[PDB]
C-alpha cells in the first residue's frame, strides 16, 4: 500500500503532489536557469517537452527538492498535452524507468483529467494555460483526436500583449522582472468584456472601469481598457497578428468535427481548464458567443470550476486513486520486459 505520485508538467508551471490529495503540495516554475558566462529556458514550449536534459532537471527537482521523496518508492503519474507525438511519450517513459527508476508509471492527457475533475466522462474541454490552448472533445473517457483544436496563444502571449498596450499609456514594462509584474496585473485586474465595443465606449467616455495597481516600489498606476483588451485576444487573435480563429470559433469547430450523435452532449458540457480561463466574465462571454454560432434550439452550458487552475492535477489525483485505473499502470517489469511500444495500450 505505497503512495502514488501525480506530476503535471505545464509550459509555465509544474504542478506536483501525491494522489488522493485535494491539492498539489508543490507548484513551481518550469524553468532551468542558465548563465551568460538570468538567462532562463522554458523546457516545455507550447505544452510539448522540447529539451530533455533540462526536463530531467525539473523532474530531479520535483522528487528531491520539492516533494522530498524517493522516485523508486512511488508509482508516478505524468501528464501530457493533447496530440503529443508518439516518440515524445516513449522518451518520458524511458527517462522515468531508467533515470528515475520508478516502480510504475502512466502518461495521461491533460484535458481529459480536467474533465474527470468536473465529474464527467464526456464533454468538450477548453484547456488554456501559459503556453497553449486546446479544445479537446471527449466521449466515454476517450479523447477524439481528429476533433482536437490547438491554438498557440495562452497566458504568456496575453502578458506580452498587455506589456505592449501599457506602453501606449506611457508606462515602460520591458524587462523579465517587469514582465512578472505585468503578469500579476493580468491575473489581478483583467476580465473578459461581455461586449467589446460597448466596453471600449464605457472606457472612452468615463473612468468607471479604471483600477489602481500598487507596484513593488510603492507607486500606484492606473489601467483602463487594457483590463479587457488583453484577454479579448482569446476571442480575437488577430490583435497580436494571428489569423487563427478565436477560442469560441474553435470550440464550435471542435464540436462540428465530431459525430453528430454526441454534439448535443458536447455543447451541454463545456468545461474550462487552465489559468487563462480564470478571467472574470469568461464564462458569460463563451455562452454568448457559442449561442450565436450554434442552432437556435441548442442548450449551451459552460462549466467553470473555481479550482480550474489545478483541474488537471486534481484529475490525476482522482484517477491515480481509482480502482479501475490500477490495472492500467506500467510496472518496471512490464517495461523492461515489453519495451517502449507498451505505453500505447
Beta bridge partners of 123: 138
By the rule CB under 6 A, 130 interacts with ligand LAR? yes
Distance CA 74, CA 69 (A): 8
* Among the listed residues 6, 12, 92, 138, the single contact to ligand LAR using CB under 6 A: 12
Considering beta carbons, is residue 172 or 324 the nearer one to a copy of itself? 172
Q: Which of residues 20-39 bind a copy of itself (CB under 8 A)?
A: 36
- Provide, rounded to whole angstroms, the least separation between the CB of residue 27 and ligand LAR: 8
Candidate segments 123-131, 193-201, 259-267, 302-310, binder of a copy of itself by CB under 8 A: 259-267
The contact pattern for a copy of itself, residues 326-345, with x = CB under 8 A and - = no contact, is --------------------
In 35-122, beta strands by DSSP E: 39-41, 44-45, 48-49, 76-80, 104-109
| Residue 50 neighbours by CB under 8 Å, 6+ apart | 43, 44
Query: Comparing C-alpha atoms, which of 112, 117, 141 is closest to residue 318?
Result: 117
φ, ψ for residue 18, nearest 5 deg: -95, 130
Please count the residues of the chain: 345
Considering beta carbons, is residue 140 or 337 the nearer one to a copy of itself? 140
Of a copy of itself, ligand LAR, ligand ANP, none, which one does residue 95 interact with (CB within 5 to 8 Å by kind)? Answer: none
* Among the listed residues 177, 204, 220, 292, the single contact to a copy of itself using CB under 8 A: 177
DSSP 239: G
Q: What's the chain's Rg over C-alpha atoms?
A: 21
The DSSP bridge pattern shows strands 142-143 and 330-331 to be unpaired
* Among the listed residues 251, 254, 276, 317, the single contact to ligand ANP using CB under 6 A: 276
Kind and range of the H or E run holding 283: helix 282-293
The DSSP bridge pattern shows strands 13-18 and 5-9 to be antiparallel
By the rule CB under 8 A, 220 interacts with a copy of itself? no
By the rule CB under 6 A, 10 interacts with ligand ANP? yes
**Interface positions with Ca ion (CB under 5 A):** 10, 129, 238
Positions in the binding site for ligand ANP (CB under 6 A): 10-13, 47, 129-132, 154-156, 183, 186-187, 274-276, 278-279, 309
Residues near a copy of itself (CB under 8 A) are 36, 170-172, 174-178, 217, 259-261, 264, 295, 297-299
Amino acid at each position: 500500500e505505497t503512495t502514488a505520485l501525480v506530476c503535471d508538467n505545464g509550459s509555465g508551471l509544474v504542478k506536483a503532489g501525491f494522489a488522493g490529495d485535494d491539492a498539489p503540495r508543490a507548484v513551481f516554475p518550469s524553468i532551468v536557469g542558465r548563465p551568460r558566462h538570468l538567462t532562463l529556458k522554458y523546457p516545455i514550449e507550447h505544452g510539448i517537452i522540447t529539451n530533455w536534459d533540462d526536463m530531467e532537471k525539473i523532474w530531479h527537482h520535483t522528487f528531491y527538492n520539492e516533494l522530498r521523496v524517493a522516485p523508486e518508492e512511488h508509482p508516478t503519474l505524468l501528464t501530457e498535452a493533447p496530440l503529443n507525438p508518439k516518440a515524445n511519450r516513449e522518451k518520458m517513459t524511458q527517462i522515468m524507468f531508467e533515470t528515475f527508476n520508478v516502480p510504475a508509471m502512466y502518461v495521461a492527457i491533460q484535458a481529459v483529467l480536467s474533465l474527470y475533475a468536473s465529474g464527467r466522462t464526456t464533454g468538450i474541454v477548453l484547456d488554456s494555460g501559459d503556453g497553449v490552448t486546446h479544445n479537446v472533445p471527449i466521449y466515454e473517457g476517450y479523447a477524439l483526436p481528429h476533433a482536437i483544436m490547438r491554438l498557440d496563444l495562452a497566458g504568456r502571449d496575453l502578458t506580452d500583449y498587455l506589456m505592449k498596450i501599457l506602453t501606449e499609456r506611457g508606462y515602460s514594462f520591458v524587462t523579465t522582472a517587469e514582465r512578472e509584474i505585468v503578469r500579476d496585473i493580468k491575473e489581478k485586474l483583467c476580465y473578459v468584456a461581455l461586449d467589446f465595443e460597448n466596453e471600449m465606449a464605457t472606457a472612452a467616455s468615463s473612468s468607471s472601469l479604471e483600477k489602481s495597481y500598487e507596484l513593488p516600489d510603492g507607486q500606484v498606476i492606473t489601467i483602463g481598457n487594457e483590463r479587457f483588451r488583453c484577454p479579448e485576444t482569446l476571442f480575437q487573435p488577430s490583435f497580436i497578428g494571428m489569423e487563427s480563429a478565436g477560442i469560441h470559433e474553435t470550440t464550435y469547430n471542435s464540436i462540428m468535427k465530431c459525430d453528430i450523435d454526441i454534439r448535443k452532449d458536447l455543447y451541454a458540457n463545456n468545461v474550462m481548464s487552465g489559468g487563462t480561463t480564470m478571467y472574470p466574465g469568461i464564462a458569460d462571454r463563451m455562452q454568448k458567443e457559442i449561442t450565436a454560432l450554434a442552432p437556435s434550439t441548442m442548450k449551451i452550458k459552460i462549466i467553470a470550476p473555481p479550482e480550474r487552475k489545478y483541474s488537471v492535477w486534481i484529475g490525476g489525483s482522482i484517477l491515480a486513486s481509482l480502482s479501475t485505473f490500477q490495472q492500467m499502470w506500467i510496472t518496471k517489469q512490464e517495461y523492461d520486459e515489453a519495451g517502449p511500444s507498451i505505453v500505447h495500450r
